[PDB]
Amino acid sequence: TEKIICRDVARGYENVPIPCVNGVDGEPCPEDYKYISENCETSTMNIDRNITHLQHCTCVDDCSSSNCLCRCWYDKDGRLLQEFNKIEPPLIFECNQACSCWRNCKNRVVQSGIKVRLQLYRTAKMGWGVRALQTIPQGTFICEYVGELISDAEADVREDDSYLFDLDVYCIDARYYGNISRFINHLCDPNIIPVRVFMLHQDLRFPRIAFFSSRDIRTGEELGFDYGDRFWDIKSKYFTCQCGSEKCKHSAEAIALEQSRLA
Amino acid sequence: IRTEKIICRDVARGYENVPIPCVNGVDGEPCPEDYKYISENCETSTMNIDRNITHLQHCTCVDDCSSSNCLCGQLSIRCWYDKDGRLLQEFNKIEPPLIFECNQACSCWRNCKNRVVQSGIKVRLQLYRTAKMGWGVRALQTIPQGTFICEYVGELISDAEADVREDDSYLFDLGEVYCIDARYYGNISRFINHLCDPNIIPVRVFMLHQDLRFPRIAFFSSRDIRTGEELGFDYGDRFWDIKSYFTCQCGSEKCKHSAEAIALEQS
Ligand SMILES: Nc1ncnc2c1ncn2[C@@H]1O[C@H](CSCC[C@H](N)C(=O)O)[C@@H](O)[C@H]1O
Ligand SMILES: Nc1ncnc2c1ncn2[C@@H]1O[C@H](CSCC[C@H](N)C(=O)O)[C@@H](O)[C@H]1O
Ligand SMILES: COc1cc2c(cc1OCCCN1CCCC1)N=C(N)C21CCC1
Ligand SMILES: COc1cc2c(cc1OCCCN1CCCC1)N=C(N)C21CCC1
Ligand SMILES: [Zn+2]
Ligand SMILES: [Zn+2]
Ligand SMILES: [Zn+2]
Ligand SMILES: [Zn+2]
Ligand SMILES: [Zn+2]
Ligand SMILES: [Zn+2]
Ligand SMILES: [Zn+2]
Ligand SMILES: [Zn+2]
């Protein structure tokens, strides 16, 4: 039987609680990491936080016009536009503290936090995973990939390379410090896309990673994104993809078929 | 000018937990707009604040941090907040200790007892035009003693940068020595006037970082405050040695900086 292990893995840090369930095995709530809601530093990074360096708008409205300096890819409901390049996404510049606009303007989606109801759950083959507890329309903001900010050289020397997100060159490592997104599994048929966002600062070395639904997501459906080739070139030697989709490109079988395809 | 008019519904532009309206029933002065309202301190040059999460002293509390075992409370001497988020009656309102609130490195929940200042403005305040001191800040409700009012927010600057600034009216003194300058970038607290009989006390607080060069300034009521009462604190002698260009218009029987007070001292 499916049991609710933890009522909130975020410990009240998010807008909504993120419960943890397990109806697959006897694994307890993971506690080998520190849940953080915002990105952290473990060495001097000196993020350029000069308020005068911020590109900002002069809008006195809610920022729905084409005249907003900060195109604005959000619609009235905070969703990415249908015409948004889900293949090669542009950089998003949300409104900030230098903008003359109100805190509740239409260009502050990611900075307003988690709004969708998510659950941490035990998958059959991929350990822990994240699923939707509600229907999620296309282009809705899900969560941010939060972790520890580190150099690519620091990433290369890390014992655990399982929770790394490449920024461009810098990485977010969610191994020791992370949020709900450190539990999102790889899918060869993904339903979320990562987006580089700028909010309170505009230092190009450190974009913030925001996940948006790339299609309408059904209740109970597992969230996942394409981890990319860098992860799968390192990791395939140790384990293969268990997504079980008909389009799987990293399975063991798919790996055996392409290795045999040449000869 | 005769009747009190609402000049702005929210000077904070939705940035605070509550709207901070502006009124004027004294003169023709419109809503001040010669500054940028910010809800958190800003920087205009590298302050190199130590934000290394590993440098944070944090607690191991698995409860709500009400026990004497809370490392964050022990640093503050004891956690000075009561159950309702108010400073204790025994709190040194004359020489306040440094407050270390819980942070992101603490194992405790976001709703623990040691996170008052980091939760923002809860009291209802108004920006209003005073008779003699330009703009001022008053309570739109009764405020018990030890309640958190607002933070003194502004631009972080060196003492050397402060010395060269044309306007020295919005400075709060905190790598050597640093200042908060609310002249160009500030929050509702840049409008709080000096009172020789003050009802608020500034407190040095640490939250997300513990870089001792940069405490955050939190105002707490030093006594029970009545509705409509003007908020004010003692600006101290550094301001009054430079400024007393003009004299104190607080009009209290205890005034130590009025033209009358300065004349009686010298004579
Ligand atoms: N499609 C996939 N197939 C197999 N394992 C996967 C997977 N996507 C993610 N994983 C596993 O999850 C790791 C990335 S971190 C994602 C959360 C992880 N399941 C957990 O329980 O903490 C991978 O290195 C691998 O161990
Ligand atoms: N007790 C006092 N008497 C006279 N002027 C005062 C005062 N306290 C503050 N002020 C005025 O307010 C300045 C500090 S900033 C406080 C807000 C200010 N009244 C405004 O309308 O912008 C002082 O430099 C002085 O100009
Ligand atoms: C093994 O995976 C990676 C390894 C590395 C990496 C990124 C990786 O991850 C790709 C993105 C999958 N993750 C997205 C969030 C969680 C998984 N950048 C690096 N410099 C290295 C090379 C050695 C360190
Ligand atoms: C003239 O006043 C000050 C001048 C200065 C100052 C502090 C002053 O006042 C503080 C106390 C009243 N303020 C509290 C918040 C708003 C006013 N720190 C400085 N380095 C200087 C010396 C030259 C710049
Ligand atoms: Zn705008
Ligand atoms: Zn805006
Ligand atoms: Zn803007
Ligand atoms: Zn797959
Ligand atoms: Zn504690
Ligand atoms: Zn705590
Ligand atoms: Zn703590
Ligand atoms: Zn006075």
XYZ file of C-alpha atoms and ligand atoms in Angstrom:
638
model
C 0.000 0.000 0.000
C 1.065 3.625 -0.844
C 2.093 5.504 2.323
C 2.630 9.290 2.859
C 6.114 9.371 4.387
C 6.685 13.189 4.598
C 3.944 15.874 4.524
C 6.450 18.489 3.183
C 9.978 17.804 1.922
C 10.424 21.608 1.433
C 9.801 22.152 5.220
C 7.466 25.123 4.471
C 10.053 26.790 2.100
C 7.800 26.690 -0.976
C 4.419 28.391 -1.657
C 2.880 24.924 -1.453
C 3.855 21.764 0.554
C 5.635 19.002 -1.439
C 4.633 15.625 0.093
C 6.580 12.377 -0.290
C 4.945 8.955 -0.951
C 6.251 5.400 -1.347
C 4.110 2.454 -2.521
C 6.931 0.603 -4.329
C 9.525 -0.299 -1.676
C 10.771 0.225 1.884
C 13.010 3.244 1.120
C 12.361 6.083 3.664
C 12.202 9.840 2.847
C 15.595 10.908 1.374
C 17.564 13.043 3.861
C 21.131 12.933 2.419
C 20.822 16.603 1.228
C 19.793 20.017 2.477
C 16.527 21.311 0.962
C 17.088 24.951 -0.149
C 14.573 27.129 -2.006
C 17.190 29.488 -3.523
C 20.651 28.957 -5.093
C 23.661 28.901 -2.688
C 27.486 29.614 -2.843
C 30.279 27.514 -1.275
C 33.132 29.727 -2.652
C 33.454 33.400 -3.792
C 31.459 33.825 -7.059
C 30.702 37.602 -6.716
C 27.451 37.609 -8.681
C 27.202 41.111 -10.244
C 24.346 42.542 -8.020
C 24.934 46.221 -8.961
C 21.356 47.648 -9.133
C 22.675 50.187 -11.778
C 23.789 47.275 -14.056
C 20.193 46.061 -14.367
C 18.340 46.510 -17.649
C 14.806 47.429 -16.476
C 11.520 48.762 -17.826
C 9.723 52.107 -17.293
C 6.212 50.537 -17.316
C 3.592 52.100 -15.017
C 1.076 49.320 -15.953
C 1.209 45.511 -15.396
C 3.823 44.986 -18.192
C 1.417 43.407 -20.802
C 2.514 45.823 -23.571
C 5.114 45.372 -26.371
C 6.833 48.530 -24.928
C 8.200 46.621 -21.868
C 12.046 46.791 -22.125
C 12.323 43.511 -20.078
C 9.521 39.779 -26.354
C 7.798 38.995 -22.966
C 7.067 35.296 -23.453
C 4.407 35.145 -20.801
C 0.687 35.340 -21.503
C -1.930 36.870 -19.082
C -2.018 33.682 -16.927
C 1.785 33.403 -16.572
C 2.170 30.749 -19.288
C 4.765 30.644 -22.052
C 3.404 31.636 -25.488
C 2.534 28.855 -28.037
C 5.120 30.438 -30.426
C 7.910 30.069 -27.775
C 10.900 28.135 -29.122
C 10.628 24.952 -26.983
C 13.614 23.526 -28.975
C 16.087 26.477 -28.665
C 14.606 28.716 -25.864
C 15.697 32.377 -25.644
C 17.029 33.921 -22.395
C 14.111 35.228 -20.185
C 14.563 38.655 -18.415
C 11.912 39.003 -15.740
C 11.101 42.351 -14.098
C 13.331 43.286 -11.173
C 13.766 45.837 -8.315
C 15.035 48.502 -10.799
C 11.769 48.320 -12.864
C 9.218 51.065 -12.083
C 6.435 48.443 -12.328
C 4.492 46.838 -9.443
C 5.613 43.530 -7.768
C 2.503 41.872 -9.291
C 3.266 42.659 -12.970
C 2.887 39.975 -15.760
C 6.691 39.507 -16.137
C 7.530 37.912 -12.744
C 6.388 34.281 -13.119
C 9.516 32.357 -12.021
C 10.262 34.802 -9.154
C 6.770 34.136 -7.672
C 7.646 30.469 -6.925
C 5.868 27.123 -7.172
C 2.121 27.214 -7.833
C 1.456 23.638 -9.160
C 0.836 20.694 -6.714
C 3.680 18.202 -7.044
C 4.581 15.076 -5.208
C 7.862 13.324 -4.454
C 7.245 9.630 -5.148
C 9.011 6.305 -5.492
C 9.156 5.082 -9.107
C 9.276 1.388 -10.104
C 12.715 1.561 -11.797
C 14.286 5.073 -11.408
C 14.349 5.553 -7.609
C 12.561 8.766 -6.590
C 10.651 10.854 -9.103
C 8.383 13.881 -9.292
C 4.774 13.754 -10.486
C 1.891 16.236 -10.912
C -1.043 16.064 -8.428
C -3.098 18.102 -10.926
C -3.459 18.784 -14.649
C -0.826 21.235 -15.923
C -1.427 23.196 -19.163
C 1.431 23.693 -21.688
C 3.885 26.526 -20.822
C 3.159 26.545 -17.066
C 6.133 27.150 -14.708
C 6.787 24.139 -12.575
C 9.850 24.717 -10.361
C 13.423 25.985 -10.538
C 16.533 23.761 -10.673
C 18.074 25.028 -7.368
C 21.435 23.972 -5.915
C 25.001 24.898 -5.099
C 26.796 27.254 -7.570
C 30.173 25.839 -8.769
C 32.727 26.008 -11.626
C 32.891 23.293 -14.360
C 36.419 22.509 -12.956
C 34.856 21.988 -9.466
C 32.108 19.803 -11.105
C 34.771 17.598 -12.814
C 36.395 16.864 -9.382
C 33.043 16.059 -7.605
C 32.595 12.407 -6.442
C 28.812 12.506 -7.257
C 28.047 13.811 -10.793
C 24.321 12.802 -10.729
C 22.794 16.240 -9.794
C 24.629 18.631 -12.086
C 23.052 21.224 -14.344
C 25.337 23.091 -16.789
C 24.732 26.842 -16.925
C 26.306 27.912 -20.241
C 31.015 28.048 -17.733
C 29.323 27.181 -14.392
C 27.104 24.411 -12.929
C 24.370 24.016 -10.396
C 25.125 20.996 -8.269
C 22.021 19.801 -6.401
C 23.801 16.850 -4.715
C 24.248 18.453 -1.254
C 21.987 21.448 -1.467
C 18.894 21.309 -3.655
C 15.136 21.630 -4.084
C 12.349 19.316 -5.467
C 13.870 19.518 -8.982
C 16.892 17.365 -7.888
C 14.345 14.481 -7.960
C 13.170 14.967 -11.544
C 14.188 11.953 -13.724
C 15.316 11.837 -17.356
C 12.682 11.021 -20.030
C 13.407 10.261 -23.720
C 9.836 11.608 -24.286
C 10.065 14.749 -22.004
C 7.111 16.825 -20.730
C 9.231 19.755 -19.258
C 11.846 22.095 -20.754
C 14.535 23.990 -18.847
C 14.697 27.775 -19.436
C 17.527 30.241 -18.579
C 15.939 33.106 -16.566
C 17.266 36.381 -15.076
C 15.492 38.007 -12.202
C 17.121 40.016 -9.336
C 20.540 40.065 -11.118
C 21.649 39.901 -14.778
C 25.133 38.267 -14.446
C 25.261 36.097 -17.651
C 27.492 33.430 -15.952
C 24.610 32.557 -13.567
C 21.188 32.129 -15.217
C 18.530 30.492 -13.096
C 17.044 27.283 -14.501
C 13.274 27.272 -14.716
C 11.231 24.250 -15.795
C 8.102 24.847 -17.890
C 5.673 22.164 -19.203
C 6.405 21.556 -22.974
C 2.871 20.080 -23.372
C -0.322 19.592 -21.320
C 0.460 17.252 -18.416
C -2.155 14.933 -16.870
C -2.641 14.360 -13.101
C -0.350 11.571 -11.797
C 2.017 11.906 -14.749
C 5.798 11.810 -13.991
C 7.750 14.944 -14.762
C 10.935 14.633 -16.697
C 13.257 16.358 -19.086
C 16.001 15.340 -21.538
C 19.250 15.232 -19.467
C 21.198 15.471 -22.732
C 24.230 13.606 -24.152
C 26.876 14.860 -21.666
C 25.178 12.901 -18.825
C 24.397 9.831 -20.998
C 27.969 9.541 -22.381
C 29.389 9.345 -18.808
C 26.561 7.399 -17.139
C 25.639 4.729 -19.723
C 28.750 2.626 -18.753
C 27.235 2.316 -15.206
C 23.442 2.121 -15.925
C 20.929 2.441 -18.757
C 17.661 4.345 -19.332
C 14.540 2.852 -17.662
C 12.002 5.399 -19.080
C 10.396 2.497 -20.993
C 9.109 4.715 -23.817
C 8.869 3.438 -27.439
C 11.190 6.401 -28.344
C 13.937 5.560 -25.710
C 17.433 6.398 -27.013
C 19.392 5.291 -23.905
C 17.718 1.885 -22.808
C 20.553 -0.861 -23.026
C 18.702 -2.271 -26.077
C 18.866 1.073 -27.999
C 22.583 1.229 -26.944
C 23.188 -2.408 -28.195
C 21.304 -1.716 -31.515
C 23.352 1.430 -32.474
C 26.691 -0.246 -31.449
C 25.653 -3.169 -33.790
C 24.199 -0.766 -36.478
C 27.736 0.247 -37.635
C 29.206 -3.325 -37.985
C -4.791 71.463 1.174
C -7.614 71.902 3.793
C -8.974 68.285 3.389
C -6.787 65.104 3.767
C -6.249 63.479 0.352
C -4.936 59.973 -0.522
C -1.951 60.746 -2.868
C -0.792 57.108 -3.454
C -2.549 53.807 -2.606
C 0.844 52.051 -2.157
C 4.259 53.734 -2.094
C 5.849 50.208 -1.936
C 4.206 49.335 -5.314
C 3.082 45.886 -4.005
C 6.572 44.951 -2.665
C 5.600 44.732 1.018
C 3.186 42.240 2.727
C 0.812 45.176 3.143
C 0.199 48.352 1.013
C 1.723 51.574 2.438
C -0.589 54.466 1.416
C 0.399 58.125 1.264
C -1.813 60.991 2.493
C -1.546 64.786 2.583
C -3.841 67.116 4.591
C -1.232 69.803 5.361
C -0.040 71.213 2.000
C 0.114 70.811 -1.799
C 3.181 68.481 -1.869
C 2.514 65.428 -4.153
C 3.734 61.864 -3.484
C 7.581 61.908 -3.221
C 9.177 60.374 -6.325
C 12.846 61.507 -6.051
C 13.950 57.941 -4.996
C 13.498 54.305 -5.949
C 11.388 52.257 -3.475
C 13.221 48.966 -2.762
C 12.116 46.308 -0.240
C 15.609 44.847 0.354
C 19.048 46.440 0.612
C 20.789 47.113 -2.741
C 24.504 47.662 -3.735
C 25.961 50.110 -6.301
C 29.594 48.865 -5.941
C 31.123 45.526 -4.816
C 30.561 45.070 -1.081
C 31.918 41.450 -1.247
C 29.401 40.200 1.365
C 30.291 36.765 2.654
C 27.381 34.572 1.343
C 29.210 31.179 1.584
C 26.400 28.868 2.978
C 29.211 26.811 4.716
C 30.272 29.943 6.733
C 26.826 30.115 8.349
C 26.487 29.246 12.005
C 23.118 27.431 12.057
C 21.086 25.311 14.393
C 20.318 21.537 14.359
C 16.740 22.024 15.726
C 14.145 19.497 14.591
C 11.434 21.367 16.642
C 10.416 25.198 16.129
C 13.573 26.619 17.908
C 11.960 27.344 21.288
C 14.634 25.405 23.270
C 17.850 26.803 24.877
C 19.751 24.289 22.608
C 19.113 26.479 19.462
C 22.593 27.581 18.306
C 21.007 30.696 16.555
C 19.350 31.730 19.867
C 22.621 31.121 21.884
C 24.503 33.453 19.453
C 21.870 36.177 20.140
C 22.582 35.390 23.901
C 19.014 33.864 23.941
C 16.158 33.985 21.306
C 14.602 37.343 22.157
C 11.318 36.633 20.469
C 8.219 35.514 22.332
C 5.463 33.206 20.849
C 3.851 36.140 18.933
C 7.135 37.392 17.392
C 7.610 40.204 19.929
C 10.818 41.143 21.704
C 10.942 40.043 25.368
C 10.230 42.631 28.147
C 13.768 41.943 29.510
C 15.349 42.876 26.101
C 18.012 45.576 26.435
C 16.227 48.469 24.636
C 19.224 50.719 25.561
C 22.131 48.495 24.346
C 20.459 45.795 22.119
C 22.341 42.544 21.401
C 22.953 41.268 17.841
C 20.009 39.113 16.658
C 20.871 35.972 14.671
C 17.682 34.721 13.012
C 17.428 31.193 11.542
C 18.677 30.815 7.986
C 18.709 28.388 4.989
C 21.503 26.304 6.642
C 19.322 25.595 9.729
C 17.609 22.165 9.777
C 14.455 23.853 11.136
C 11.274 24.710 9.152
C 10.651 28.138 7.467
C 7.969 28.819 10.138
C 10.246 28.435 13.227
C 10.032 31.004 16.140
C 13.347 32.729 15.143
C 12.400 34.340 11.776
C 10.453 37.538 12.635
C 12.333 40.247 10.672
C 12.750 37.945 7.622
C 8.906 37.586 7.408
C 8.434 41.298 6.550
C 6.019 44.097 7.492
C 2.836 43.051 9.320
C 1.773 46.380 10.962
C -0.364 48.889 9.105
C 1.534 52.107 8.420
C 0.894 55.246 6.486
C 3.141 57.791 4.771
C 1.770 61.201 5.730
C 2.583 64.901 5.596
C 3.547 66.317 8.996
C 2.999 69.982 9.969
C 6.707 70.796 10.494
C 8.936 67.806 9.504
C 7.896 67.181 5.859
C 6.823 63.550 5.381
C 6.475 61.172 8.324
C 5.333 57.652 9.147
C 2.405 56.876 11.449
C 0.620 53.722 12.721
C -2.891 52.994 11.348
C -3.388 50.602 14.301
C -2.259 50.030 17.892
C 1.189 48.424 18.131
C 2.248 46.516 21.294
C 5.809 46.900 22.725
C 8.520 44.806 20.980
C 6.626 44.405 17.681
C 8.716 44.500 14.470
C 7.803 47.486 12.369
C 10.031 47.634 9.254
C 13.643 47.422 8.204
C 15.902 50.439 7.416
C 16.518 49.607 3.754
C 18.809 51.306 1.243
C 22.007 51.346 -0.735
C 25.053 49.771 0.982
C 28.046 52.137 1.002
C 31.454 52.645 2.649
C 31.984 55.319 5.289
C 34.343 57.061 2.749
C 31.560 57.003 0.093
C 29.086 58.433 2.704
C 31.499 61.333 3.510
C 31.550 62.348 -0.218
C 27.713 62.147 -0.684
C 25.956 65.512 -1.388
C 22.842 64.415 0.624
C 23.670 63.105 4.141
C 20.007 63.082 5.359
C 19.226 59.333 4.805
C 22.292 57.643 6.243
C 22.273 54.836 8.779
C 25.660 53.752 10.205
C 26.494 50.058 10.432
C 36.104 45.798 5.708
C 36.026 48.759 8.222
C 32.781 50.832 8.722
C 29.726 50.861 6.373
C 26.522 52.897 5.896
C 23.027 52.354 4.532
C 22.066 55.256 2.311
C 18.350 55.564 1.682
C 18.642 58.798 -0.348
C 18.344 57.213 -3.812
C 17.154 53.730 -3.022
C 15.059 53.129 0.086
C 11.882 51.805 1.745
C 9.167 53.331 4.039
C 11.765 53.729 6.845
C 13.542 56.554 4.884
C 10.473 58.635 5.907
C 10.697 58.018 9.652
C 11.486 61.300 11.501
C 13.645 61.870 14.579
C 11.902 62.061 17.995
C 13.556 63.185 21.252
C 10.917 60.924 22.934
C 11.259 57.868 20.562
C 8.747 54.991 20.249
C 10.988 52.698 18.024
C 14.482 51.227 18.501
C 16.829 50.035 15.746
C 18.192 46.458 16.100
C 21.141 44.812 14.288
C 19.856 41.536 12.707
C 21.484 38.700 10.706
C 19.399 36.470 8.467
C 20.549 34.957 5.139
C 24.243 35.872 5.722
C 26.317 36.490 8.887
C 28.863 39.001 7.482
C 29.265 41.117 10.658
C 30.226 44.217 8.583
C 26.641 44.225 7.225
C 23.926 43.879 9.890
C 20.371 44.595 8.788
C 18.536 47.308 10.703
C 15.227 46.329 12.145
C 12.913 48.739 13.936
C 10.912 47.419 16.902
C 8.407 49.409 19.044
C 10.131 50.383 22.387
C 6.673 50.857 23.990
C 2.982 50.381 23.132
C 2.101 52.712 20.237
C -1.396 54.183 19.748
C -3.245 54.429 16.385
C -2.375 57.653 14.491
C 0.843 58.096 16.471
C 3.974 59.171 14.508
C 6.827 56.712 14.468
C 10.264 57.959 15.268
C 13.618 57.044 16.689
C 16.605 58.918 18.163
C 18.841 59.808 15.148
C 21.731 60.254 17.605
C 24.416 62.953 18.054
C 26.368 62.380 14.785
C 23.367 63.657 12.746
C 22.499 66.480 15.207
C 26.111 67.818 15.382
C 26.180 68.227 11.548
C 22.508 69.372 11.010
C 21.736 71.671 13.973
C 21.147 74.213 9.167
C 17.838 73.384 11.009
C 16.559 72.519 14.477
C 14.318 69.815 15.973
C 10.545 70.307 15.434
C 9.401 67.226 17.466
C 7.671 69.595 19.905
C 8.030 67.252 22.884
C 8.588 68.583 26.449
C 11.807 66.456 26.450
C 13.250 67.924 23.135
C 17.071 68.185 23.244
C 17.577 69.590 19.721
C 15.011 72.420 19.312
C 16.203 76.052 18.782
C 15.069 76.554 22.470
C 17.157 73.542 23.692
C 20.341 74.597 21.786
C 19.957 78.195 23.123
C 19.522 77.036 26.809
C 22.579 74.685 26.635
C 25.004 77.362 25.270
C 23.684 80.117 27.668
N 15.530 7.731 -17.254
C 16.305 7.272 -16.268
N 16.667 5.967 -16.291
C 17.337 5.463 -15.247
N 17.739 6.084 -14.132
C 17.403 7.387 -14.152
C 16.705 8.045 -15.154
N 16.597 9.399 -14.868
C 17.228 9.527 -13.727
N 17.739 8.354 -13.233
C 18.502 8.181 -11.991
O 18.431 9.383 -11.236
C 19.711 10.068 -11.271
C 19.578 11.558 -11.546
S 18.924 12.424 -10.091
C 17.123 12.165 -10.254
C 16.461 11.623 -8.993
C 16.830 10.152 -8.623
N 15.918 9.145 -9.169
C 16.833 9.866 -7.088
O 16.212 8.937 -6.622
O 17.556 10.675 -6.383
C 20.503 9.338 -12.354
O 21.916 9.426 -12.221
C 19.995 7.908 -12.193
O 20.566 7.346 -11.010
N 12.768 66.005 14.529
C 12.966 66.583 13.333
N 12.855 67.933 13.246
C 12.990 68.518 12.050
N 13.210 67.950 10.861
C 13.316 66.613 10.973
C 13.219 65.868 12.140
N 13.395 64.518 11.874
C 13.591 64.479 10.578
N 13.569 65.708 9.971
C 13.807 66.008 8.554
O 13.779 64.795 7.813
C 15.126 64.442 7.396
C 15.453 62.980 7.634
S 14.573 61.907 6.462
C 12.922 61.748 7.227
C 11.786 62.039 6.254
C 11.621 63.528 5.876
N 10.756 64.330 6.747
C 11.028 63.765 4.449
O 9.990 64.386 4.306
O 11.727 63.277 3.465
C 16.039 65.387 8.179
O 17.284 65.622 7.532
C 15.174 66.645 8.273
O 15.134 67.319 7.013
C 26.916 12.798 -15.434
O 26.247 14.031 -15.710
C 26.973 15.220 -15.867
C 28.377 15.333 -15.719
C 28.965 16.594 -15.877
C 28.197 17.743 -16.205
C 26.832 17.661 -16.361
C 26.212 16.402 -16.178
O 24.820 16.372 -16.228
C 24.206 16.757 -17.466
C 22.751 17.079 -17.093
C 22.021 15.938 -16.316
N 21.518 16.496 -15.029
C 20.421 17.509 -15.121
C 20.071 17.760 -13.657
C 20.262 16.375 -13.008
C 21.027 15.516 -14.041
N 28.987 18.921 -16.353
C 30.248 18.535 -16.102
N 31.303 19.394 -16.208
C 30.401 17.032 -15.735
C 31.493 16.250 -16.488
C 31.912 15.580 -15.146
C 31.098 16.656 -14.398
C 24.123 64.230 9.042
O 23.885 62.904 9.507
C 24.798 61.894 9.296
C 26.021 62.055 8.568
C 26.858 60.955 8.443
C 26.511 59.677 9.020
C 25.338 59.471 9.758
C 24.450 60.596 9.882
O 23.230 60.416 10.529
C 22.955 59.070 11.054
C 21.734 59.137 12.003
C 20.437 59.713 11.352
N 19.863 58.910 10.223
C 19.195 57.606 10.603
C 18.555 57.163 9.284
C 18.014 58.486 8.693
C 18.858 59.620 9.360
N 27.461 58.688 8.724
C 28.414 59.300 8.023
N 29.492 58.630 7.572
C 28.210 60.819 7.778
C 29.343 61.790 8.279
C 29.394 62.449 6.875
C 28.450 61.339 6.317
Zn 7.637 46.395 -18.000
Zn 7.178 44.578 -14.727
Zn 10.606 45.344 -15.942
Zn 14.710 6.447 -22.120
Zn 17.189 26.484 16.051
Zn 14.803 28.015 13.395
Zn 18.588 28.345 13.326
Zn 13.308 67.039 19.520
